[PDB]
């Protein structure tokens, strides 16, 4: 029944005032992209930065198993768009947020499916 809960540990570390995981790989791009959350090439819009996906994945970066049967990672090999105001902590952002499954934007950071 025991499982390490790294997501909870990082969130609690952040809340206690710890400095976010660094050296996430920020890409050069046009910043005229679709703004969707996780894409095959950088798609940052004017309000986002694009990062190499593996470098923003808590499980990749901490060398721990991914939390699903398959152990699959949906960031590695892709690019993740982070709102520029949140780009100081890309790992925390991806952990704490959800991608809208119909439009592909971050819920609350681009998804307008509910207005």
């Amino acid at each position: 029944a025991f499982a390490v809960d790294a997501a909870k540990a990082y969130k609690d570390y952040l809340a206690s005032g710890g400095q976010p995981i660094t050296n996430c790989v920020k890409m050069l791009c046009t910043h005229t992209g679709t703004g969707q959350a996780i894409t095959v090439t950088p798609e940052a819009n004017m309000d986002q930065e694009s990062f190499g996906g593996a470098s923003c994945c808590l499980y990749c970066r901490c060398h721990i198993d991914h939390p699903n049967p398959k152990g699959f990672c949906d960031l590695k090999g892709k690019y993740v768009q982070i709102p520029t105001t949140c780009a100081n902590d890309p790992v925390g952002f991806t952990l704490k947020n959800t991608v809208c499954t119909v439009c592909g934007m971050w819920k609350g950071y681009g998804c307008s499916c509910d207005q």
Binding site: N23, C24, V25, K26, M27, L28, C29, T30, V40, T41, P42, E49, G52, G53, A54, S55, C57, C60, R61, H63, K76, G77, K78, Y79, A87
Partner: protein, 298 residues
Amino acid sequence: SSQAWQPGVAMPNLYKMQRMLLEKCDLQNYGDSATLPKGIMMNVAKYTQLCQYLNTLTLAVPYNMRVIHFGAGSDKGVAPGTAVLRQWLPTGTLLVDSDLNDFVSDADSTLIGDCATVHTANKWDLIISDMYDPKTKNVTKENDSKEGFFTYICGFIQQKLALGGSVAIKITEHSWNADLYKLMGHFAWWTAFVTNVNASSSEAFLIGCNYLGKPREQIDGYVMHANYIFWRNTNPIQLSSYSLFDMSKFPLKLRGTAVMSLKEGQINDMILSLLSKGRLIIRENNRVVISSDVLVNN
């Protein structure tokens, strides 16, 4: 220096034709730094400019292109250069990377260990290497041709680079190999390319463009490295990040370059001419299979 808006500077052909003696590299702009865009790492900027320059060459770009990237790890435990290569290469390109030390990567597959342990069943369309041993920067001893991973790279090119394929292999004043320069004469064209963001360093990428599998030109690698240092010593390059701000035409154009299997007897002058223009890749098109040798002991 209208060069400041380029991604970097390639060694001019006349410098390749000299017969200079090797001297110490003394760069006028040593210790100067380019101002990188906010939050961008040097290695992202450097690989972006390398790829921008490769966009100007006659690279063969087949469907299911195969690219291998040596020296892809960082002391940060991530792979910025691999992330730029994956951004640059057409979607669906198979990208493998490798480093002595463990790291987290966006490549399709990653091998950890000395490059000499790496073996592949298949041939490759493009080989990128950033391998570098800082112990070579010993200004107090003679600067002779280095072996180590350069010996592996020379063999890997000769055995596992598809005809028509290309390479970009990092060198410095002290990290270089004479046989690798000689191998540049086995491509349709070659150069030493200096990125504008890192122009204060004796680093360059030795680029072989369209592999022919035989000497087109006989190059003395000791002379050619001396020629390279002479060029760098007499041509200060203005540090520049300008090209990083225009990424609208960054992605490598998927050219759908033909891939053919051909045995050594069928590579005629007409085939060699297609290879030389970036219009043909010669290799099998089976599955990509790789491995790392593990030494077992106690």
